[PDB]
Structure formats: structure tokens, C-alpha cells
Amino acid sequence: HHHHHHMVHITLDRNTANSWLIISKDRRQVRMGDTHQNVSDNKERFSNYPMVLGAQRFSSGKMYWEVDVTQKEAWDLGVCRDSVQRKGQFSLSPENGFWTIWLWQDSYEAGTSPQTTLHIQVPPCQIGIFVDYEAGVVSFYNITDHGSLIYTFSECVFAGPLRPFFNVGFNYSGGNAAPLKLCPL
Ligand SMILES: Cc1cc(N2CCNCC2)nc(C)n1
């Protein structure tokens, strides 16, 4: 792919984070803490899952960024509507305003309803995410395997501004403590 030139500098929005997340001072990394991080509650925070949004909002254009997932056992990545539900239980699906892929239990899925099996021969250490707002496209690339395509959501109905979306995943196993990191341009 030749999407690298639409690169955007993404930073994480502390105010949207689940209360157990630790966002770095540069707002480029996030990890699961072992306890509540001593923040006040607010209506923006994801309550049920270790989720956070990027600060940037996109309503036009082509955007590309990369995320480091090295040594993680579980995570979700993609984009979502600015108006997604924050509280309680919900599915990551386009009907609920999410365009995402996951790792869980040694398999990769796309967040369709129902979910779609992904075919990845080289487990990725970095994921590239491409959004074409006007075309209604969200695509995922395997940076570890020369940029190979992972998955394309097409005919997307965004229906609002989009935000970068992250889930660091739970760490019940003690093997999923590693952070998500936004990779340099
Ligand atoms: C990586 C991951 C897993 C997950 N589930 C929750 C329901 N049971 C199956 C596992 N949910 C999310 C949002 N992310």
C-alpha cells in the first residue's frame, strides 16, 4: 500500500479513558494499570472495558496511523463514531458505530456482526489503520509483513465524526500488561 503519506499524529484523550488506564505524558502510549488511577468519573469514560479514544476528530479526507501491539495477548483497534455508547455492555460492530479488528485467544477477528475470521500468517507487532472518509473505507495493514492487507470495511456508514479507537484488553492472565503505542511517522 501507498497510504503512508496520509500519516496523521494521533494522541490519546485522557478524559475518555477507562479509570484503570495509564496514558503516558506524551499521550502516545496507554496501558492497563493494576488498580483505579485516582481520576474523577465523567460521562465520556468507557466504564466496562479498558478503552480510550484519540483526541483527533475526522469528518473528511484520508488518514493513516500505526499502532504497536508487541507481546500483547488481547486488544481491539480501529475507529468509531464520536457518539458511541460509553457505559454498560455493548458489541463492537458497525451498527453500534465501530470499525475494528481484535486479537483474542490466539485468533484475529474483524468486528462485523457476527465477527469475521482473519487470515494472518505473520502475527503483527505493528498495525496500520487507513480511513477514507468520502469513500466509506477503513482498512488494516500488517506492518510486520511488508504492509500486507488484513481487512477492509467498505460501504461504511460513518454517520458522524470519527475518532481513533483503542482497547488495551484485560490482564486476567498476567501476560497482557504491555502497552498500545502510537508509532512515529
Ligand atoms: C479482545 C476482546 C475480547 C472481547 N470479548 C468479550 C466477550 N467475550 C469474548 C471476548 N471483547 C472485546 C471488546 N475485545
- Residue whose CA lies nearest to ligand 1 atom number 8: 104
Q: Is 20 in the pocket of ligand 1 (CB under 6 A)?
A: no
**What's the gap in Å between 169 CA and the centre of ligand 1?**
8
DSSP string, the chain: ---GGGB----EEGGGS-TTEEE-TTSSEEEE-SS--SPPP-TTS-SSSSEEEES--BSSSEEEEEEE-TT-S-EEEEEEETT---SS----STTTTEEEEEEETTEEEE--SS-EE---SS--SEEEEEEETTTTEEEEEEGGGTTEEEEEE-S----S-EEEEEE----SSSS--PPEEEPP-
Q: Which of 4, 9, 161, 163 is nearest to 79 (CA)?
A: 163
- Please give the grid coordinates belonging to residue 97: 458505530
Ligand 1 atom closest to the CA of 102, numbered from 1? 1
Domains of the chain (ranges; CATH) run 4-10+56-182 (2.60.120.920)
76 in ligand 1 pocket by Cβ < 6 Å? yes
Output Rg (C-alpha) for the chain, integer angstroms: 15
- For residues 18 and 26, give the distance between their C-alpha atoms in angstroms, rounded to a whole number: 18
Strands 75-81 and 137-142: unpaired
Distance CA 3, CA 7 (A): 8
Q: Say if residues 63 and 54 touch (Cβ distance below 8 Å).
A: no
What order do you get walking across the sheet with 29-32 strand by strand?
Answer: 21-23, 29-32, 180-182, 62-68, 126-132, 137-142, 148-153
Contact 180, 173 (CB under 8 A): no
Q: What region, left, alpha or beta, does residue 168 occupy, with left being phi > 0 and alpha being psi -120 to 50 degrees?
A: alpha
CA 183 to centroid of chain Cα atoms: 13
- Side chain identity at residue 34, one-letter code: D
Q: Smallest Cα–Cα separation from 179: which of 32, 65, 18, 48?
A: 32
Q: Compute the distance between CA of residue 142 and CA of residue 151 in angstroms, rounded to an integer.
A: 10
User: Listing from the earlier edge strand, what are the strands of the sheet with 98-104?
Assistant: 12-13, 51-54, 162-167, 75-81, 98-104, 107-110, 116-117
In angstroms, this model's resolution equals 1.3
Q: State the Cα angle at 47 between 158 and 45, rounded to 5°.
A: 65
**Distance (Å, whole) CA 32 – CA 23:** 9
What is the Cα–Cα distance from 98 to 96, expressed in whole angstroms? 6
Q: How far is CA 162 from CA 6, 80, 116, in A?
A: 16, 5, 22
CA of 144 to the centre of ligand 1 (A): 24
Do the Cβ atoms of 181 and 65 come closer than 8 Å? Answer: no
- Cα separation, 181 vs 118, in Å, equals 22
CA distance 118 to 19: 31
**Cβ-contact 41, 15 below 8 angstroms:** no
CA distance 117 to 22: 31
Q: How far apart are CA 168 and CA 69, in angstroms?
A: 9
| Gap from CA of 6 to ligand 1 centroid (Å) | 30
16 CB within 6 A, ligand 1: no
Q: Out of 102, 112, 165, 172, give the residue to mutate to test ligand 1, the one with the largest number of ligand atoms within 8 Å of its CB.
A: 102
Elucidation technique = X-ray
